[PDB]
Amino acid sequence: FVREHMAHATRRLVHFYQARIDPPRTANEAKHDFSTKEFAKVDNYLLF
C-alpha cells in the first residue's frame, strides 16, 4: 500500500533497517515453501 512519498530511496533504504523489524512474508514467500505434494494437502493454509 504505502507510497512512502519517494524522495531518495538511496538513503531512505537502510533507514528501515535501523529498526530491526521484518514484515511477515505475506502469502507468496509463504507459498513458495509449499511443494507439489505439500500444496494439495490439508496443511496448506494458503489454499484459499
Add this chain to the structure above:
Amino acid sequence: VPRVATGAGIPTSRQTTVMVSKYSEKSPITIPFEISAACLTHLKETFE
C-alpha cells in the same frame, strides 16, 4: 415394531410405533379433438 431385546446391559429399545399417511399425486390427461364447421353443418342443416 418387534424388539429382540435381551442382554446383560445390551441397550434395549421401547415399542417404537410408526405411522405414515400417504398423499395422492395428480396428473390429469387431456387430448383435444376438432370437428369441422362444415362437418357440423352437413350434420345439422341437411340440404335437399
Add this chain to the structure above:
Amino acid sequence: AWVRQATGARRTEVLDSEAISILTFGRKTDKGGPALLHGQRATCEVIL
C-alpha cells in the same frame, strides 16, 4: 505453536480439569468430519 501448526491444529477443547477426564474416560474428541465418501478409516505407526 509451531508443531501444532506444522500438523494437527487442534490443541484442546477441554480444560486441564477435564484433560484428566479424557485420560479417565476415553472421550470421542474428533467428530465425524464431513468428508466421508469411503467410510471408516484406520491407521497406526511403528518406527523402523
Add this chain to the structure above:
Amino acid sequence: ETTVLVTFEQRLTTGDVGKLSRLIGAVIPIPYRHHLLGSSQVGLDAVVKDKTRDYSRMRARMREMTLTIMRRVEGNQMILGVPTHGQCYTIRNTGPVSWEKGDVLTTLPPVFSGEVTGLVSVSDWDLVLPWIVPMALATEINQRMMMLALLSLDRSHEEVRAATAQLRVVRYRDATLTLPEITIDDTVLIDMRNVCISLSMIANLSSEVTLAYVRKLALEDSNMLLMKCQEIYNITPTEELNKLTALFVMIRQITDVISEQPAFLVCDVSPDDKSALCIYK
C-alpha cells in the same frame, strides 16, 4: 430404572453367594442403570485395577457411578433397587467405621490399604464395594491429599516423605487407614489452584476485626483453642456484612473442594452396629 436385575456372567461358587446372602443391603455402584446388567459393570472393582491407580482419579470417577442396594440374593439373581432421593434405606457396613448415628455418610473409592478381595477373586475378578464413611473421614482423607500436594510444592525431595508419614496414619473412629502414597495429579492441581485463590481472597476480605479477633482475645482469655493458635475503630458494619458474606462464599466453596457428596443420612443404627437405617441420597 430402579430395580436392577444383575447377570453374574462369571463362574461363582456356593461360598460366594453365601457371603452376599448375609450382605443383603450393601452398596453396589452401577454405571449404566438398566434393569438388566452384567457383573462386568456391576461392582466398583473394575476401575480400581487401573494402571495409574491413584486416589485422584478414582474419587473423581465414581461420582458418575449410580449407587444401588443389594436385595434378594438367591443363586444367580441380584436384585439391586436404585434408591430414590429421600426414602429410608438400611445399609450393611462395608468398611469398619461404626458410622455414629445422626450424621451424613459419603462414598470412599476403595480401602486402598492393599487390594482387598471385595467378595472373592472369581476368575481373577472380585466384586469390591465402596467404603461408606461418615463424611468426617471423607473430608479429612481428601484434605490430606491436598495438604501433601501443597507440601510438595515447596519441598525438595525428602521432607515430603518425612512429613507425609507424619500425616498418613489417619487415626479415625475404629480405623487407622493410609494415604495412598500421594501422587501429584492434575485434578488436584486445578483445584489446589482455586484453594490457593480462595485463601487469597479471605486475606483480602479480612477487614481488621475478623483479623485481630484472636490477637485481641489472647490478651483477655486463656483457652485451649486460644493458646494453641498463638503459635499457629471503624463504624462501617453494613460493609462488614458484605465482606463477611463474600468471605462465606469462599469457605462454603473451599470446604466443598475437599468435602464430598452428601449421601445416606442415618435414621438409626442397630446395636449390632452393622445395619443402618439411612435416608437422603
